[PDB]
Design an enzyme around this catalytic site. Structure first.
Site, short mmCIF file in Angstrom:
data_model
loop_
_atom_site.label_atom_id
_atom_site.label_comp_id
_atom_site.label_asym_id
_atom_site.label_seq_id
_atom_site.Cartn_x
_atom_site.Cartn_y
_atom_site.Cartn_z
N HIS A 280 0.88 -1.19 0.14
CA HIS A 280 -0.06 -0.01 0.08
C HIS A 280 1.04 1.27 -0.05
O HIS A 280 2.21 1.29 0.02
CB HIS A 280 -0.90 0.07 1.13
CG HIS A 280 -0.25 0.18 2.38
ND1 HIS A 280 0.21 1.41 3.00
CD2 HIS A 280 0.06 -0.62 3.64
CE1 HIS A 280 0.82 1.24 4.17
NE2 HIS A 280 0.62 0.11 4.52
N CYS A 298 3.30 -4.99 6.81
CA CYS A 298 2.63 -4.86 5.25
C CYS A 298 3.91 -3.98 4.44
O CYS A 298 4.97 -3.92 5.21
CB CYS A 298 1.71 -3.21 5.27
SG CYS A 298 0.25 -3.57 5.82
#
Ligand SMILES: CC(C)OC(=O)CSC1=C(C(=O)O)N2C(=O)[C@H]([C@@H](C)O)[C@H]2[C@H]1C
Ligand SMILES: N[C@@H](CCC(=O)O)C(=O)O
Length: 351
Positions: A280, A298
């Site tokens: 992301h 992440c």
């Protein structure tokens, strides 16, 4: 001259007749003049006689918990024969509906398993597996493996070959899936494998390299999980993608106000594990990307590279993580299927 003979696919007085197949009647030494089958309330069931008059079959779905009465007459040169039969169909204790991924007509990446998720726990996994018919073209060996009591996966030994057609027929209507649980309906989906897209994140370089049919097309600096919350090594299957999403750690079992909790709105987010790993946009860590790990797990990349990933990676493409200080992604994560050794996957876990 012989009297005509009537033969039905059910016996008079039968109970527990399964509704996974039509009911039929055939004549010998004669032809079928009339066949009717009615519900206990008197409503007729749709059926059709063959043009030669020898075989009649129901043509609509038969119901659970029904008492049906079949009346047939055959006529031949040698006379007439009439029979009346009454039977009861299966009476389920429970009904379960299957939900299949990926979607019908979708084009997906070389890592996409067939996924069949029932809305109730399956007591007889073997019965469910036998009711699922997978067709592949070009044909390839594959096998079923259960991620939990409700969801079974099917995949080959190695990533799919681009251009493969996959057909999934979940034929559970009328099928006893254990402990009186029967299938609520049938479901049927078809998908196709597209280009091979494999993106590798190497902790030694902190670069996420995207390869399309073996060619490097993008090299993205990344910041992965810090040492206290590292990114697991292994093979990840790309799932859903979001132009923006509020990532809520409580979704993944971690309270927001706890030391590793978070609630964060991010752009251009591609999910790669059920445990909550995404690629992301991370404008706050652009300085660290390509240099140091700062995330909760992440794969932080720049806003433009996250948008590129969103635009160019599809469900079923592959992200491989290597050389981090984490463990290996669990095989039963939900998107971790390829981390299970083939010998183990192929053996299955229906028992
Ligand atoms: C068949 C496999 C390969 O993928 C899918 O079924 C897609 S369903 C979807 C994903 C995803 O990103 O794929 N999930 C999560 O996160 C949800 C988990 C926490 O329950 C599910 C849901 C929102
Ligand atoms: N998000 C957590 C609790 C977070 C908090 O500490 O407020 C949950 O409801 O499961």
């Amino acid at each position: 001259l012989l009297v005509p003979k009537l033969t039905a696919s059910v016996t008079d007085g039968a109970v527990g007749v399964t509704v996974d197949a039509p009911v039929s009647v055939t004549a010998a030494d004669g032809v079928l003049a009339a066949v009717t089958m009615v519900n206990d309330n008197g409503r007729p069931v749709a059926g059709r006689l063959s043009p030669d008059g020898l075989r009649w079959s129901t043509t609509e779905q038969l119901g659970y918990n029904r008492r049906y009465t079949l009346n047939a007459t055959a006529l031949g040169l040698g006379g007439a024969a009439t029979r009346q039969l009454t039977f009861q169909t299966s009476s389920p204790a429970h009904l379960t509906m299957p939900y299949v991924m990926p979607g019908d007509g979708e084009v997906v990446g070389v890592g996409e398993p067939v996924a069949i998720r029932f809305d109730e726990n399956i007591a007889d996994r073997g019965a469910a597996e036998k009711a699922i018919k997978i067709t592949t073209n070009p044909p390839v060996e594959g096998a079923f493996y259960w991620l939990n009591n409700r969801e079974v996966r099917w995949r080959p030994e190695h990533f799919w070959k681009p251009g493969t057609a996959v057909d999934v027929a979940v034929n559970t209507y009328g099928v006893d899936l254990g402990e009186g649980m029967f299938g609520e309906d049938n479901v049927q989906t078809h998908f196709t494998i597209g280009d091979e897209v494999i993106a590798t994140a190497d902790d030694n370089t902190k670069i996420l390299t995207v390869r399309v049919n073996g060619e490097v097309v993008k090299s993205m600096p990344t910041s992965m999980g810090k040492d206290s919350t590292p990114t697991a090594n292994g093979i990840y299957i790309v799932g859903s993608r979001y132009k923006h999403i509020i990532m809520d750690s409580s979704t993944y079992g971690v309270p927001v106000n706890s030391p590793n909790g978070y609630r964060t709105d991010v752009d251009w987010a591609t999910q790669i594990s059920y445990s909550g790993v995404f690629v992301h946009s991370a404008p706050w860590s652009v300085g660290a990307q390509g240099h140091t790990n700062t995330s909760h797990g992440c794969l932080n990349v720049s806003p433009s590279n996250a948008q590129w990933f969103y635009d160019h990676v599809k469900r079923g493409d592959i992200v491989e993580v290597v050389n981090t200080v984490g463990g290996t992604l669990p095989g039963i994560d939900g998107l971790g299927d390829w981390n299970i050794p083939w010998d183990q996957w192929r053996a299955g876990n229906a028992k």
